[PDB]
Structure 1
Amino acid sequence: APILGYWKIRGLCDPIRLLLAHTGQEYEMKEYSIGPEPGYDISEWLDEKFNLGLDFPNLPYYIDKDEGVKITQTVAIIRYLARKHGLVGESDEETIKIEMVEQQAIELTLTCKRAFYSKDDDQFNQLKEEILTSFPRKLIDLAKFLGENQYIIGDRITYVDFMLWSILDYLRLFEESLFDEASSLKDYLTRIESLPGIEKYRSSDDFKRLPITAPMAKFGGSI
């Protein structure tokens, strides 16, 4: 069975786990603990980081011994899984649209990540201000792009829908009022979370015990 490695949080790995839940692919989840404050001990990972044969040691990682693959980098992993499962564009037109949204979703995710793991209240507040001021426009742009479609390229779900749903879910949990100009994104959230494999994953004990972020974060550190 393939092995997915990550912290016991949703974090960056969330879209990968949603894609795997949607497809029903069998895999082993290798979870690494973060110890309690103030040490936030991460020994189980630090002891393995350099002994897994990874070219770029990091979390998340995906190892399938049977297929001969070992991959790090969230985007490389999710694209690999997307190709394996057919959740990619069937035209260059579709691929351009998927890749533009992939990058827009990552841009929002990184901005949130930087905010969530801010060093102090000053920095957290500065980055929250930038989010509250710039994200409304970006959510309108995403809504316009989606239009009347079920998913990003139309009727067929692709890997980018999982990346967009994860960040939109985090934003709904961080500031719900951000969707007051794009109710279609609320329907998008309901559509994807209602898909059977995703609903089963989200209603599982394993998912419900996951904080969004690691214990040191200014937001999401506790379920």
Structure 2
Amino acid sequence: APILGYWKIRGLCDPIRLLLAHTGQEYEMKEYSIGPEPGYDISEWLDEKFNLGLDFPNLPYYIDKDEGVKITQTVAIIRYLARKHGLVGESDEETIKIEMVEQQAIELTLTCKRAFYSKDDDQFNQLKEEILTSFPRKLIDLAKFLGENQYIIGDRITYVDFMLWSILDYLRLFEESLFDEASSLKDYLTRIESLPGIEKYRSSDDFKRLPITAPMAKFGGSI
């Protein structure tokens, strides 16, 4: 059985788990606990970190002995899984669209990552301002690109829908007014959540006990 390793948070790994939930692929979830403040012990991870034969030892990792793969870096993992499960473009035209949206999703995600784990309120309010200021335009551009489509490239769901859904879900939880009346993207969120594999995952206890972030975060550190 393949193994996915990560913290006990939604975090970076969320789009991967949604992809795996949608496809129904069996895998073992290996979870690493973070101890309480102020020491935030991560000893479980450090005990395996160097012992797993990883090139770039980090979480998440994806290992599948049978297929002979060992992968770190969320986007490399999710693209690997997309190719395996047929959740990629079936023409260059689709691939271009997927990859443009993919970079937009990554930018949103990495800006939020920096905001959520800000050191002091100073740093946090600075990035919050950036988010509230720049993101509305980016969500409008995404809505305009999605149009009347069900998913990014149209009728068929692809891996980027999971990346986009994840970061929009985080933003909705961070500041609802970014999307409260943002109608098309709300329908998009609803549509992807209603897919049976994702619905089953989101209604499971394992998901409901996951905070968005690790406990030291300024946002999302608890359920």
Q: TM-score range by the shorter chain?
A: over 0.9
Deviation of residue 184 (structure 1)? 0.3
Ranges of 4+ aligned residues in structure 1 off by more than 2 Å = none
- CA-based RMSD of the aligned residues comes to 0.7
Residue 36, structure 1, aligned to residue 36, structure 2: yes
TM-score normalised to structure 1 length: 0.99
- Distance between the aligned counterparts of 2:181 and 2:222, measured in 1? 29
- Distance between the aligned counterparts of 1:40 and 1:10, measured in 2? 17
- Distance between the aligned counterparts of 1:181 and 1:8, measured in 2? 32
Deviation of residue 209 (structure 1)? 0.2
Whether contact under 8 Å (1:98, 1:160) holds in the other structure is: yes
Whether contact under 8 Å (1:63, 1:71) holds in the other structure is: yes
Deviation of residue 180 (structure 1)? 5.1
Deviation of residue 182 (structure 1)? 3.1
Whether contact under 8 Å (1:3, 1:27) holds in the other structure is: yes
Whether contact under 8 Å (1:136, 1:181) holds in the other structure is: no
Deviation of residue 181 (structure 1)? 6.1
TM-score normalised to structure 2 length: 0.99
Cα deviation digits, residues 36-88 of structure 1 (max 9, x gap): 11110000001111100111111000000000000001000000000000000
Cα deviation digits, residues 3-44 of structure 1 (max 9, x gap): 000000000000000000000000000000000111100000
Q: Percent of aligned pairs with the same residue?
A: 100
Cα deviation digits, residues 141-167 of structure 1 (max 9, x gap): 000000000000000000000000000
Q: Which runs of 5+ in 2 are unaligned?
A: none
**Secondary structure of residue in 2 paired with 1:71:** strand
**Secondary structure of residue in 2 paired with 1:47:** helix
Aligned residues: 223
Cα deviation digits, residues 90-117 of structure 1 (max 9, x gap): 0000000000001000100000000000
- Distance between the aligned counterparts of 1:151 and 1:24, measured in 2? 19
**Secondary structure of residue in 1 paired with 2:5:** strand
Residue 8, structure 1, aligned to residue 31, structure 2: no
- Distance between the aligned counterparts of 1:187 and 1:180, measured in 2? 11
Tell me what 1:212 maps to. Answer: 212
